[PDB]
């Protein structure tokens, strides 16, 4: 339920984040305020792009700090059919216009990401796949919370939010430890019983070693689909307890080829790296 996803955001980190965006955008004197004055005003939020609406909590938080209210005519997660009237913002003219840029930028990107995620979720459902579409750690620094939240609204999984969410043995960890077995034993030992271990693998060989050493998840990285499913099928056969994730060169276009009955998770970097922002405007009436 996309409407209840707003509960995920701790209100204290939210305010801090929004604060910093507002200091970033206006550090000193706001001369443009004298142009608008402080008279009460109303603006309409317009969706000019198709996709999924995501980011209301951030949008609200921004305008709240600035003593404006927002009324939403569409719930979080709604399909957007341009040109749609999405919300109304009310408050002192100068405060409205102060929040405009940050609020739109935030909503545009969050919705951009949710849109991409929903497209990918739909494509996978359209190929009869039951697994989880997921984002990667390829997010914008300092903006991770908005991007991970966008993914969730679009129906995708956030994945590990940070390095502390699960112990991820990437190919570089393997090199540094001197081999998969050594890396996964080290990982499994270090990781609290609280955490799962995932291992990035480029071959069936590595994948089997990883599962043998107690990997909870195996990330089959950069396989061609023809090599992927045979590999995944064997892993699940020998190790039904181990989850299989696929990632690497996955696009919305080729996503159905990567879906298969033995792939539990598909994670796509494009959901955050390449997701174009939606066009929104805030017209004062």
């Amino acid at each position: 339920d996309a409407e209840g996803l707003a509960l995920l955001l701790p209100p204290v980190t939210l305010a801090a984040l929004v604060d910093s965006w507002l200091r970033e955008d206006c550090p000193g004197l706001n001369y443009a305020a004298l142009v608008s004055g402080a008279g009460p005003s109303q603006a309409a939020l317009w969706a000019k792009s198709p996709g999924v609406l995501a980011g209301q909590p951030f949008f609200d938080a921004i305008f709240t700090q600035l003593n404006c209210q927002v009324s939403w005519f569409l719930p979080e997660g709604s399909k957007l059919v341009p040109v749609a009237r999405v919300a109304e913002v009310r408050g002192p003219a100068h405060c409205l216009l102060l929040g405009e840029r940050v609020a739109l930028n935030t909503l545009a990107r969050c919705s951009g990401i949710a849109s991409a995620a929903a497209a990918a979720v739909e494509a996978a459902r359209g190929a009869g796949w039951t697994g989880h579409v997921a984002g990667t750690r390829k997010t914008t620094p300092g903006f991770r919370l908005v991007e991970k939240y966008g993914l969730l609204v679009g129906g995708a999984a956030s994945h590990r939010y940070d390095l502390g969410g699960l112990v991820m043995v990437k190919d570089n960890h393997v090199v540094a430890a001197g081999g998969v077995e050594k890396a996964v034993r080290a990982a499994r030992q270090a990781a609290d019983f609280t955490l799962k271990v995932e291992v990035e693998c480029s071959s069936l060989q590595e994948a089997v070693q990883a599962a043998e050493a107690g990997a909870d998840l195996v990330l089959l990285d950069n396989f061609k689909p023809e090599e992927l499913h045979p590999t995944a099928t064997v892993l699940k056969a020998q190790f039904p307890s181990v989850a299989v994730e696929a990632s690497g060169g996955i696009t919305l276009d080729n996503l159905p080829q990567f879906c298969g009955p033995h792939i539990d998770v598909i994670s796509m970097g494009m959901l955050t790296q390449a997701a174009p922002a939606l066009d929104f405007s805030l017209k004062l009436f």
Copy 2:
């Protein structure tokens, strides 16, 4: 000279920014450190996408915080022909791997933007236009510095960095003030003698009123090219002292149609909102 652009970054704001990215990514215990250990290591930075390289100062700042050094084999601004070996990073294995994600994510986006900017700069030069290609204020909150820097490396102009850089009279300021003349007189009166006033205009009528009231720049927003140049030509004729900027629905594809002898600046939201990140990897050897 793209190599000397690193001087633009105040080293103190840089370190603070990099710090926050590193707290964001690992707030607590880093269990994966036990997998790699602290032995000295070396990683190679690989460019897997074409475009322009941008973001070295951020990349360095990240790895310096983590007691690693970086050696660049290509100067800032170099054309990237994949698959190219761009740099070498050296330091304790766990520290290297700690900086990997944030450093790549940063470099990917900064270079993504620089690439897009350079494409647009080339297209405009290819149509014999002498003006400045520019970005907009449509940036990612908290990440503005990296994005504005990327634009510069790609040969585009940053535009107003924040609300304090120049007094911008958008269409909403016009509505709030009750008209262009009122808004621009208010703006000109408020704006320090230090600052320029720019006015967003949707018609030749507004543009002329704006210039008459002392606008330094006039932003012709969302004109079709056929309406734009005639409008621009007249403005320059009556007001040669006033700069003309064009923006709205400009793409790399249609950019040459928007170039003309009386357009001083062309600003494209897609340079920041639609610029796809470049593919980089950091392989430990």
Copy 3:
């Protein structure tokens, strides 16, 4: 309109600033709170110095953080004729007294600067000069916002708020670049199309080179008035598009000598460096 200047202050940076002042002043346990108790109280704000009133937004922001309200009997920018009753502050006694020092210190300095600015603006109007009186970048670190705001209330111009507001080529930039032409070309090529370039000049020669290389403003630094106006007159003649600013050794006393028809801006360091604070007090007159 000095009453509408409060809109210039972004409310978010304001609160952050006020916060830090309040942590600075009471980092730990406030034992004096036990002396006053928390009973509702009222205090009167008294202006004991002549000048201009400036700083209400800061004064309010401080007391709002401390759950007190303020009622102003004079609008921002009012001339102060001591001894005047300027405002009333209401709230829990301990909260009132917690904000007293920071609020007065802030109001005193902001008003001090506004007063000096208004004196300078008046002197210049009294010599029939139409230009802008301005402050300099000679402000107190961390307190820039209050000081630049005070200047505005007193009718002076803030100038570049920071290094990002306009590209300023000082004499040191000239030395480093190897000459005025080199510096101004470098500056002009650097400053975004969105920014103006200003060049600090000590001679007519430099001023002409600067204008020739595309300087938007020329700052005639430390000229004697007798050398200044002839120089300014020529500059305006050859380059009417270029603004002329005068600065250096300008006092309220000698300010009229520096005014002239070809000087657009006069900037005085004394407006911020040497502006004495006004005397204000906050006398508590109530309980329950």
Copy 4:
């Protein structure tokens, strides 16, 4: 010893403070950096005003953050006779020029305050007074550390640095508590055994009540000198253990009238409110080509 006063500054709060000044002054892109370039350079710090030199630690901290070094030709606290060459600063041209404004502004104000303090300390010594000249809590918000340090370099006392340094019963606390005795009892009971209590008094009456209730210090506020010394003399007679501070309408000019054998401290608001900044400049004298 003014040279050893730098030890008072905790290096961690110093760096944080300097950091914020530098973010304040350049939040975004520094276009002027392209004008100077990054070649090594050297600038001379010039004192153009008389007074006392104060603020070296802040000046250094600023330029250290910007990878520049500073060499001082005069120790902290030196008398300044203009026009004097006070220091040299070395580093990349753009980094030098980035620090110039904040560094000068800081040094100018810290020295301004130290100068005023030293003038007041001298005037008091010239009237044979042995007491402490002090500043007040009338400081610039956020800039308290520089200003209190300036006072110290000029030979004045900082007074309570904040509200936690000593428990100060101002006239408003008296009003709120319902009287001096109530306020001072409340205050001392409140105060830890760690802290002194000081009471702001406008009459001899209040002063005696305050001393009787266990005030460690009594601040005789806004007395005319003719009323002050008789009052101070009596207080010291009845209560030799209690320190007497005088404040209110004290100027460098009238300061000697306020000095007397029974006044322990004289605190002047003008040392921080009205101390004009000294004129300093940083003139680059050399730039060299980078490599």
Copy 5:
């Protein structure tokens, strides 16, 4: 009056402190919020340990940030007789549960410290001692404000809150200065007239030198009681203006042996370093 101690806390530093605790505990997405939902709820705060109740301002500040209200059935400083119903917290379910852990942890520790302090204050009153029981600087970094407040609620003195509250000449300062006289003269000079000087002494010799050089307080560190009172008695005789503090190896058990007519202050590092947290729970009943 323990109820009026809440005034000591500057509300601005309080909010900042509480903020940081809340960012610390939930930096990212709060998935558990989906389990509770946002429906209005009510929880009961239960005291499961004996001792003194301390920390209400912090507890409130936490829940106010999270848009919840608190109603207290016991005033700050009340004796706790388990199992007692201490308060009711109301607000959106997810917000309540978000504040639970930080709020309990804070109240547990603040009350833990207040309890220990009150025990020590009682023991000293029970031996007819009129002096001040005090805490030391042996506090948890970043949590000093809660701990010093807890001490106050339990009836103990906070002592110097930080290094700026009074000039403390510890044994290491003596070593560095080259002797007590040199250290105390240096301290007395340096310290503003506004501040008191205290000197940590391990012998009567040092104590006398310290008092002679103008020490306002003398801290008799790690004396056995039999050596302490004779020393204290002499100091007070020669120097009645100088306050005498005792510290070092003082426990609630041996505290009465350290009380004496010439000891003004007794400071116990255990009041904060050994004071077990009280057991509290927050049980949702709607």
Copy 6:
């Protein structure tokens, strides 16, 4: 290996944390600095209590900010036999003395916790138990990182570091959801695929419902040992994939009664809430 545990601490969060402690302790002018002067000095760190040494990274970080160096004569995790000479600190006298209090306080508490943890780990090993001793979320606010690190050095497990480490369904979540099944289904649906779900249970009934609904862990809260092991034995029999944790009223004294072959984790609140600080001193010589 307790010596390699220092790698777990992200150096950026460490410095920030240490910074705040140092601002907390000296916000203004340090008058005591004039008493010591700035002459180079050396101090000896003395352990006056038995237990385990823990906290070196914090101790170092403190003194590094203050331009002092530290030489350790005992590795992190060493048994302390008082009165032992543990380290030497060198630097300017005033800087040494500035760091003294914070450094000792930190080391005392970290070591206090490690000591308690090691005692509990020993007692459990002495009863032939192979499971993990763990801490709880009952930590000091703002000081969590030091306390969780202390636990690790003493050989105990940190447990969930924060609310994002694993989805914990406490008894209050059960009440709010309207029952165990509802809560655990909601939790399992919400938890990312990357997270484990743990459910706090007060009866065998709840425990079985929880396991049936897909709980990865079951926390048997406040059982008497006689009720606990029978319950644990059945759970493991029906559900071997589900981990069993015991907590509530566990002391070092009664810990062996709570150990049993079907208890995987034992978590004790006393390891953090009751662990007395060790006595250390820093004597300047």
